[PDB]
Design an enzyme around this catalytic site. Structure first.
Site, PDB file in Angstrom:
ATOM      1  CD  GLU A   1     -12.435  -1.761   2.409  1.00  0.00           C
ATOM      2  OE1 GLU A   1     -13.113  -0.700   2.561  1.00  0.00           O
ATOM      3  OE2 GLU A   1     -11.189  -1.795   2.208  1.00  0.00           O
TER       4      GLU A   1
ATOM      5  CE  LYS B   1     -11.355   0.881  -0.015  1.00  0.00           C
ATOM      6  NZ  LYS B   1     -12.347   1.526   0.877  1.00  0.00           N
ATOM      7  CG  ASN B   2      -6.984  -4.700  -0.695  1.00  0.00           C
ATOM      8  OD1 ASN B   2      -6.758  -3.564  -0.298  1.00  0.00           O
ATOM      9  ND2 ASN B   2      -7.527  -5.635   0.060  1.00  0.00           N
TER      10      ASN B   2
HETATM   11  C1  LIG Z   1       3.127  -5.788   3.195  1.00  0.00           C
HETATM   12  O1  LIG Z   1       3.713  -6.349   2.024  1.00  0.00           O
HETATM   13  C2  LIG Z   1       2.897  -6.502   0.934  1.00  0.00           C
HETATM   14  C3  LIG Z   1       1.526  -6.384   0.963  1.00  0.00           C
HETATM   15  C4  LIG Z   1       0.751  -6.552  -0.190  1.00  0.00           C
HETATM   16  C5  LIG Z   1       1.377  -6.847  -1.391  1.00  0.00           C
HETATM   17  C6  LIG Z   1       2.773  -6.967  -1.422  1.00  0.00           C
HETATM   18  C7  LIG Z   1       3.537  -6.801  -0.288  1.00  0.00           C
HETATM   19  O2  LIG Z   1       4.903  -6.905  -0.251  1.00  0.00           O
HETATM   20  C8  LIG Z   1       5.533  -7.545  -1.356  1.00  0.00           C
HETATM   21  C9  LIG Z   1       0.601  -7.040  -2.671  1.00  0.00           C
HETATM   22  C10 LIG Z   1       0.908  -5.993  -3.737  1.00  0.00           C
HETATM   23  C11 LIG Z   1       1.144  -4.667  -3.411  1.00  0.00           C
HETATM   24  C12 LIG Z   1       1.420  -3.750  -4.416  1.00  0.00           C
HETATM   25  C13 LIG Z   1       1.449  -4.196  -5.709  1.00  0.00           C
HETATM   26  N1  LIG Z   1       1.226  -5.471  -6.059  1.00  0.00           N
HETATM   27  C14 LIG Z   1       0.960  -6.344  -5.076  1.00  0.00           C
HETATM   28  N2  LIG Z   1      -0.840  -7.167  -2.415  1.00  0.00           N
HETATM   29  C15 LIG Z   1      -1.599  -8.111  -3.010  1.00  0.00           C
HETATM   30  O3  LIG Z   1      -1.142  -8.894  -3.838  1.00  0.00           O
HETATM   31  C16 LIG Z   1      -3.051  -8.195  -2.637  1.00  0.00           C
HETATM   32  C17 LIG Z   1      -3.417  -8.203  -1.286  1.00  0.00           C
HETATM   33  C18 LIG Z   1      -4.733  -8.278  -0.918  1.00  0.00           C
HETATM   34  C19 LIG Z   1      -5.727  -8.350  -1.895  1.00  0.00           C
HETATM   35  O4  LIG Z   1      -7.034  -8.426  -1.532  1.00  0.00           O
HETATM   36  C20 LIG Z   1      -5.390  -8.344  -3.235  1.00  0.00           C
HETATM   37  C21 LIG Z   1      -4.060  -8.268  -3.611  1.00  0.00           C
HETATM   38  O5  LIG Z   1      -3.766  -8.265  -4.942  1.00  0.00           O
HETATM   39  C22 LIG Z   1      -1.363  -6.186  -1.466  1.00  0.00           C
HETATM   40  C23 LIG Z   1      -0.748  -6.414  -0.105  1.00  0.00           C
END
Ligand SMILES: COc1cc2c(cc1OC)[C@H](c1cccnc1)N(C(=O)c1ccc(O)cc1O)CC2
Ligand SMILES: CC(C)c1ccc(COc2ccc(CC(=O)NCCN)cc2Cl)cc1
Ligand SMILES: [Mg+2]
Length: 337
Positions: free
Chosen positions: A229, A232-233
């Site tokens: 998971e 994936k993020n």
């Molecule tokens: C709901 O608002 C947002 C959610 C999340 C992000 C940004 C958000 O708004 C600014 C961010 C992201 C999304 C797309 C591109 N780059 C980073 N994330 C992360 O940086 C991230 C989160 C979880 C993880 O395990 C790894 C990550 O790099 C996703 C969530």
């Protein structure tokens, strides 16, 4: 039917947290022990969670989604009663029970998407105020934990009573290997949907044995689910922040082993997430449109945890914290009060 009096008698008893060490020592310390045990413990853990379902207000309780699973739990509870009077020794009374477990695992396979469609009909019916969030969040963490605890007992039983691995447990879990596996697999999914995919640097750190590769005693099933998971993020993030750019920064993972903490950082550089928005990334409710929180549960399950610290405008860090010791590694079970 007696189901509500069954729930009544067995919600008296407490779930019995087991250690890794205990899970292993069943190795075989024999079926009949496993049977005589589980045919108590399951009811206890079923009863306990079913008692909690019933404490939900009628506006939740009444909805199709709820009543449906509430039903499954009963049908399952009942199925395990059958074996209370039955005496072990009889290799066929044991055989029929294993079957009973399988059928129950497979009856419950859709709990997740189901509970989801209940959340969803709630958001639309009643709304998404923060107080609804805390309640949903309180309950589902427990429900889903309880759920995990049960799957654990059931697989343990069926996988043994059908040796290097001991059911879903590896006593020699090479962590880095699991990490590649989750990566490779995510990479596959990433490439497919994006035609690119950040590479993966892994670095081990062995506090004591500064050189040695890091073996640990875990349910690698669980460790994969989580790592997967997270990747994936890390990938989705890394890609969308740099689609207008060319160079795609790798995903660094670090594995630290200390006196008690085995820790896994997954650093991405995906333009991160502002602190305000972090709690939400673990909210069942605020991520239902028509993952992590469940991955988090899996961690908490053997006394670990799973946290995010991002740096808005750089990247996110995601740590899985596991107890390093079979001894410190015990079930976290939600319990009645
Ligand atoms: C709901 O608002 C947002 C959610 C999340 C992000 C940004 C958000 O708004 C600014 C961010 C992201 C999304 C797309 C591109 N780059 C980073 N994330 C992360 O940086 C991230 C989160 C979880 C993880 O395990 C790894 C990550 O790099 C996703 C969530
Ligand atoms: C579908 C599932 C996951 C679901 C969906 C929605 C909910 C919502 O849960 C709420 C919301 C508000 C209140 C206030 C109240 O009356 N408190 C009294 C309770 N002590 C109680 C509960 Cl249990 C739970 C579970
Ligand atoms: Mg956190």
């Amino acid at each position: 039917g007696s189901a509500p009096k069954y729930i009544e008698h067995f919600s008296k008893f407490s779930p019995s947290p087991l250690s890794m060490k205990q899970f292993l020592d069943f190795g075989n310390a024999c079926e009949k022990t496993s049977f005589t045990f589980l045919r108590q413990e399951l009811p206890v853990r079923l009863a306990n969670i079913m008692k909690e379902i019933n404490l939900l207000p009628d506006r939740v309780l009444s909805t199709p989604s709820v009543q449906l699973v509430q039903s499954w739990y009963v049908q399952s509870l009942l199925d395990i009663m059958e074996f209370l009077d039955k005496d072990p020794e009889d290799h066929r009374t044991l055989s029929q029970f294993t079957d009973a477990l399988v059928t129950i695992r497979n009856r419950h396979n859709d709990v997740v998407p189901t509970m989801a469609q209940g959340v969803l009909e709630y958001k639309d019916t009643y709304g998404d105020d923060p107080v609804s969030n805390q309640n949903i969040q309180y309950f589902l963490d427990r429900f889903y934990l309880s759920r995990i605890s049960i799957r654990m007992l059931i697989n343990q039983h069926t996988l043994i009573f059908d040796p290097k691995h001991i059911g879903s447990i590896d006593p020699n879990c090479n962590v880095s290997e699991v990490v590649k596996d989750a990566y490779d697999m995510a990479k596959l999914l990433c490439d497919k949907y994006y035609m690119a995919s950040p590479d993966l640097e892994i670095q081990e750190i062995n506090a004591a044995n500064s050189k040695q590769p890091i073996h640990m005693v875990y349910v690698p099933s669980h460790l994969y689910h989580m790592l997967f998971e997270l990747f994936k993020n890390a990938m989705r993030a890394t890609v969308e922040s740099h689609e207008s750019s060319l160079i795609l920064p790798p995903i660094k993972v670090m594995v630290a082993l200390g006196e008690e903490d085995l820790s896994i950082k997954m650093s991405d550089r995906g333009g991160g997430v502002p602190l305000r928005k972090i709690e939400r990334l673990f909210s069942y409710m605020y991520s239902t449109a028509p993952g992590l929180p469940i991955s988090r549960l899996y961690a908490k399950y053997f006394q670990g945890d799973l946290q995010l610290f991002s740096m808005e405008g750089f990247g996110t860090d995601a740590v899985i914290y596991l107890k390093a010791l079979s001894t410190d590694s015990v079930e976290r079970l939600p319990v009645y009060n």
